[PDB]
Design a protein around this ligand. Structure first.
Ligand SMILES: CC(C)n1nc(C(F)F)cc1C(=O)Nc1ccc([C@H]2[C@@H](O)CCCc3cncn32)c(-c2ccccc2)c1
Ligand SMILES: [Zn+2]
Ligand SMILES: [Zn+2]
Ligand SMILES: [Zn+2]
Lengths: 252, 353, 76, 400, 82
């Protein structure tokens, strides 16, 4: 009876503090929430409200509280399996905003997407895997991005998100380019340049990347037929490497 | 009747750690139990669990004669065998030679007269494993002969259990002649449903005898089946048939990465099989420079057991042959000393190859 | 009433039926004429293959319609 | 026969045996006596008359499966394993006479699943003997599902005893934990209903997953809380009550740990159980009178179970039965044409070689699945179409 | 000391592979690509066996032209679940 009235008032007021005294209040109060004596109706529900107010607080301070909360939820993860996903997603945004790809990728990796009792939707798992691969790519780690782009390949076939499939293809071509498989990445980029859904500005970017990959590809039967297709395209003259493409096509 | 329903819950839910009190109440249960009820065994098991620690052996010989009789008809086969396993397993390491020796002698004779078909078969097999693990191959054979001579098909599950025991014993005996006969005997059985530990000894010795003979393809099938069954049940020996799986895959002129199936992929980066994973990744896409470096570095992880050291001569020659074949493909006239620098072998050895 | 069936080569056979006769009866009549099994034989009228369950109600000719016989292997 | 088919099956067994003995005495293989035997057993027994107007025809040939289930199911005093085996032996002989053996393997597999997962199976050693007999009938492919089901039961049994050893090296669990790991793709069960794990059972949960991480790598666990049971005791009532209940009932009862009364909406929100399943669970709990509402005069039948009623735990629970157990259960024609077309050119073909040439050559439309093609090729070779080789490997040939 | 204590819990689980499939071990491309052969000429679909080993349709089809065993487990390869 007393829990509903008194403890609700004290929690709503303590969230509005000035400086370093806020951290001390959260240390003892959060530990009281992890305790077994609190049922999963005033701890799981209000943790979502506690998390949604965190992004308003400055990013520099939000890093320390976010890390501390994850440690305290570790003993009881199955109960709070939905708050962990949102907390780690929010923390990854802060880490990526600081040009820190390694920390952001590791935080997103820790989210249980397969070994968990919460069945995340296909779109959620597809978009998380693509972001993890992209973050690993920005860290110059093609090996790790390759592993997480394979998982996203098993979900794009049955996903109903048409835009997410385009995003997956863009990241897949980037992974192939990073893995020095230029001839395979060039074909993927060429397919992207023929899609009307994609904007014209990025369409020329895909064509430029396809031409660069074809030039960097090993000479042979497959590369020669790709050069001819690119030369026959009327949009290749806008690229700054059209002159090199013309000479390479003519076996000069 | 009415008191039987109420009293049993009171004496079970309430643990009643105080002795000399719960004993009297449970004693009245057995004598007053007239109906063919299962509840009699459950209460009878409690005294064995608690009061066995506090000696009282002279009390138990008197009560042991009627103990085995309730197994036949008071309860089902599954419940009777389940209760036996828990007690017997944990007392093996408790020494007590004066208890182990006399208990088995009086129990085996009494149970032989009543049960012969399946309950006696499994208990004797359990005792055979005890003899096997104690390194005492002098009294396992006598119980093995009586187990084997029960047919003279339709008993494949029991036959495979005996064959696995023979194979395991002869492995410790360093016997290879009997291993071939035992493996071929199990091939005639096609109607068995054994534990996935029984078909991990028959399928492992079959792969090993194929490895020794020279049939590296049939060994690969046997090692994959043995490793898969060892993965489902077992653990310590599982990452031994995987190493032989990769070695057999390298001895079949390579082809197909063993660490691509769902069973072997999780163990690809395991420290025990990491050296073999790099060995097969270098065997495929033939590169002698990396293949030799892995062999030199992992000398205490690859070139240790005789099952891989012996076959290391067949390797480092097939990979050299594949490198040689590809190297001479675009040439009409090539220099033998030029080949030697690519193969990292002597000029005389190049001519022999 | 009394129709004629022609093969591809041009051989004509004149078979007599009744309005309620079935296409299986047509095939059996052709069998008694030459000996072609019904399953190794296809019938065409107006460029469309006849279905094997309709009793010539829309094939009313009253004047000896010309049918087309095509040999085919059993089951294609 | 429809109401009590138990004694109907026993009638067939007795009649068949005695017919052979009488013929060989004086008739000396009489033509009339032998001919009358094949006409009576076929029409009168295989398909009876009342299967038509009762809109139940598929169940009629399926009453043999439940008969063998009753022999291997946990029950009262059962016949010993000395006279039962010979009666089962002649059952194998008549089994091959039926043509739709596929449905036999389905119903027996589903019934075996409920018998094994709930530990309701009796003579588990004899169950292996029964499945082994079925293997000889068709092959290991026919019993591919059944063998895996029995194998993981033994694996889980050794897994539990190994888990007990692992518990001694760590903090002992406050409750006895046993789990059937089962398998994916070989069992009829699947996770369909979401559930919120109670805070009391979470720790053990985590413990086990740790034991499943070191032992097995790259393996998940799809827990089926609808198929899990447990024993819950009460330490505040007047008398000790060791109730047996499923996970759902266990969570519902444990929700009263902190308070005394809850409404249906809070129960639905806290445990995230679907409306129909939770309604059935609440109804069966009310049958046992474990939970009562304010108004006894209110009838549960004519009053809908609105998600607002406040149910409170009955503190003066003195129900006259001490054995409460709430765990009681609550036309295509294209592939045949493709098969004959592809067998036209090649006179002799393997079974798996023919597969793929028809299974996936036309896979862009009407993905046919293996069992459909197997059944169609069976009904084809039956009607003088393929006439497979007499036993040389597994070639199916054509008009040979 | 606890107010209410649980004594037994007979759970039931269902184990499955954490990664369903990540490669076809005849062309080294994972199961969602075209098997390289379909990449050159544009279809490609998955194929399973009784061993539950997934390969490209075309890859296993040309593997079965000269052989009759599964590439991975070297057992009798029989098509299952398309
Ligand atoms: C004249 C036509 C309509 N015809 N009449 C009757 C007769 F039953 F009436 C029967 C037929 C008729 O189409 N036959 C036929 C048989 C076999 C093949 C293929 C077959 O084996 C497959 C392997 C290749 C082959 C090499 N040599 C014959 N073949 C073909 C055929 C040939 C070329 C394109 C398409 C089909 C036609
Ligand atoms: Zn492939
Ligand atoms: Zn393909
Ligand atoms: Zn396989």
């Amino acid at each position: 009876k007393d829990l509903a009235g008194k403890y609700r008032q004290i929690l709503e007021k303590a969230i509005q503090l000035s400086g370093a005294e806020q951290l001390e209040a959260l240390k003892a109060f959060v530990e009281a929430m992890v305790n077994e004596n609190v049922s999963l109706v005033i701890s799981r529900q209000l943790l979502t409200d506690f998390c949604t107010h965190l992004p308003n607080l400055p990013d520099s301070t939000a890093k320390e509280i976010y890390h501390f909360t994850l440690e305290k939820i570790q003993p009881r993860v199955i109960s709070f399996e939905e708050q962990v996903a949102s907390i780690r997603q929010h923390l990854a945004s802060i880490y990526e905003k600081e040009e820190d790809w390694r920390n952001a990728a590791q935080v997103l990796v820790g989210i249980p997407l397969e070994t968990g009792q919460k069945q995340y939707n296909v779109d959620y798992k597809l978009e998380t895997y693509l972001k993890i691969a992209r973050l690993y790519l920005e860290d110059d780690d093609p090996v790790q991005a390759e592993a997480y782009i394979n998982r996203a390949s098993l979900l794009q076939n049955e996903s109903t998100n048409e835009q997410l499939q385009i995003h997956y293809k863009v990241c897949y071509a980037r992974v192939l380019d990073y893995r020095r498989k230029f001839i395979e990445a060039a074909q993927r980029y060429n397919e992207l340049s023929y899609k009307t859904i994609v904007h014209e500005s990025e369409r020329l970017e895909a064509l430029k990347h396809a031409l660069h990959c074809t030039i960097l590809a090993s000479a042979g039967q497959q590369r020669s037929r790709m050069l001819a297709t690119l030369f026959k395209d009327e949009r290749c003259q806008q690229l700054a490497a059209y002159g090199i493409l013309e000479k390479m096509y003519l076996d000069r | 009747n009415v008191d039987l329903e109420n009293q049993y819950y009171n004496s079970k839910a309430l643990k009643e750690d105080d002795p000399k009190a719960a004993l009297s109440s449970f004693q009245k249960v057995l004598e007053l139990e007239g109906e063919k009820g299962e509840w009699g065994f459950k209460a009878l098991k409690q005294m064995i669990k608690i009061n066995f620690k506090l000696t009282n052996f002279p009390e138990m010989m008197n009560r042991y004669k009627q103990l085995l009789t309730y197994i036949r008809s008071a309860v089902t086969r599954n419940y009777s065998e389940k209760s036996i396993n828990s007690i017997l397993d944990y007392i093996s390491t408790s020494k007590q030679m004066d208890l182990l020796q006399e208990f088995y002698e009086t129990t085996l004779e009494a149970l032989k007269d009543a049960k012969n078909d399946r309950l006696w078969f499994k208990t004797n097999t359990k005792l055979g494993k005890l003899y096997l693990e104690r390194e005492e191959y002098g009294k396992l054979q006598k119980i093995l002969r009586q187990l084997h001579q029960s047919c003279q098909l339709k008993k494949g599950t029991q036959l495979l259990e005996i064959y696995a025991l023979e194979i395991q014993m002869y492995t410790a005996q360093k016997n290879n002649k009997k291993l071939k006969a035992l493996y071929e005997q199990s091939l005639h059985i096609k109607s068995a449903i054994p534990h996935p530990l029984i078909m991990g000894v028959i399928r492992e010795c079959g792969g090993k005898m194929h490895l020794r003979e020279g049939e590296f393809e049939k060994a690969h099938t046997d090692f994959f089946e043995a490793f898969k069954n060892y993965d489902e049940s077992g653990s310590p020996r599982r990452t031994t048939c995987l190493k032989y799986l990769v070695l057999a895959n390298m001895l079949m002129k390579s082809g197909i990465n063993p660490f691509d199936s769902q069973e072997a992929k999780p163990y690809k980066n395991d420290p025990e099989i990491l050296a073999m994973t790099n060995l097969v990744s270098a065997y495929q896409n033939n590169d002698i420079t990396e293949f030799e470096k892995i062999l030199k570095t992992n000398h205490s992880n690859i070139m240790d057991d005789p099952f891989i050291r012996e076959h290391i001569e067949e390797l480092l020659r097939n990979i050299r042959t594949q490198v040689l074949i590809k190297l001479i493909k675009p040439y009409t006239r090539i220099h033998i000393p030029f080949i030697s620098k690519e193969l990292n072998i002597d000029v005389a050895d190049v001519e022999s190859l | 009433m009394l129709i004629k069936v022609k093969t591809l080569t041009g051989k004509e056979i004149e078979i007599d039926i009744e309005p309620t006769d079935k296409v299986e009866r047509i095939k059996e009549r052709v069998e008694e004429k030459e000996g072609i099994p019904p399953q190794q034989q296809r019938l065409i009228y107006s460029g469309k293959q006849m279905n094997d369950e309709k009793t010539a109600a829309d094939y009313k000719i009253l004047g000896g319609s010309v049918l087309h016989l095509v040999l085919a292997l059993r089951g294609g | 026969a429809l109401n009590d088919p138990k004694m109907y099956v026993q009638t067939v067994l007795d009649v068949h045996k005695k017919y052979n003995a009488l013929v060989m005495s004086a008739f000396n293989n009489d033509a009339g006596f032998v001919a009358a035997l094949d006409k009576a057993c076929g029409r009168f027994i295989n398909n009876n008359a009342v299967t038509k107007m009762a809109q139940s025809s598929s169940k009629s040939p399926e009453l043999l499966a439940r008969y063998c289930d009753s022999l291997l199911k946990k029950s009262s005093k059962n016949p010993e394993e000395a006279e039962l085996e010979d009666t089962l032996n002649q059952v194998m002989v008549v089994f091959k006479y039926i043509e739709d053996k596929d449905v036999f393997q389905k119903f027996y597999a589903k019934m075996l699943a409920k018998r094994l997962v709930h530990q309701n199976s009796a003579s588990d050693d004899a169950e292996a003997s029964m499945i082994s007999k079925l293997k000889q009938a068709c092959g290991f492919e026919y019993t591919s599902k059944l063998q895996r089901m029995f194998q993981d039961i033994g694996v889980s049994k050794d897994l539990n005893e190994q888990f007990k050893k692992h518990l001694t090296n760590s903090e002992p669990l406050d409750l006895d934990f046993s789990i059937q790991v089962l398998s994916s793709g070989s069992w009829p069960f699947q996770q369909s209903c979401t559930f919120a794990l109670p805070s009391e059972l979470e720790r053990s949960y985590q413990r086990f997953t740790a034991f499943y991480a070191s032992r097995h790598s790259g393996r998940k666990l799809t827990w089926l809380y609808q198929l899990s049971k447990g024993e819950l005791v009460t330490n505040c009532f007047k008398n000790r009550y060791t109730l047996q209940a499923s996970t759902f009932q266990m969570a519902i009862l444990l929700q009263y740990n902190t308070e005394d009364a809850y409404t249906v909406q809070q129960l639905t929100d806290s445990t995230q159980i679907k409306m129909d399943i939770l309604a059935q669970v609440l109804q069966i709990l009310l049958k046992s009178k474990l939970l009562v509402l304010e108004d006894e005069n209110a009838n549960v039948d004519e009053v809908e179970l609105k998600p607002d009623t406040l149910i409170k735990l009955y503190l003066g629970y003195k129900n006259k039965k001490l054995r409460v157990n709430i765990n009681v259960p609550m036309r295509k024609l294209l592939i045949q044409a493709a098969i004959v077309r592809i067998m036209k050119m090649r006179k002799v073909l393997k079974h798996q070689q023919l597969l793929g040439e028809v299974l996936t050559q036309l896979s862009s439309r009407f993905k046919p699945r293996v069992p459909v093609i197997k059944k169609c090729i069976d009904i084809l070779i039956e009607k003088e179409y393929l006439e497979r080789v007499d036993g040389e490997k597994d070639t199916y040939s054509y008009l040979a | 000391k606890k107010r209410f204590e649980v004594k037994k819990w007979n759970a039931v689980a269902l184990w499955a592979w954490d990664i369903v499939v990540d490669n076809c071990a005849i062309c080294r491309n994972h199961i969602m690509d075209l098997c390289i052969e379909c990449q050159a000429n544009q279809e490609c679909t998955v194929a399973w066996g009784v061993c539950n080993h997934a390969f490209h349709f075309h890859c296993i089809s040309r593997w079965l032209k000269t052989r009759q065993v599964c590439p991975l487990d070297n057992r009798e390869w029989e098509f299952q679940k398309y």
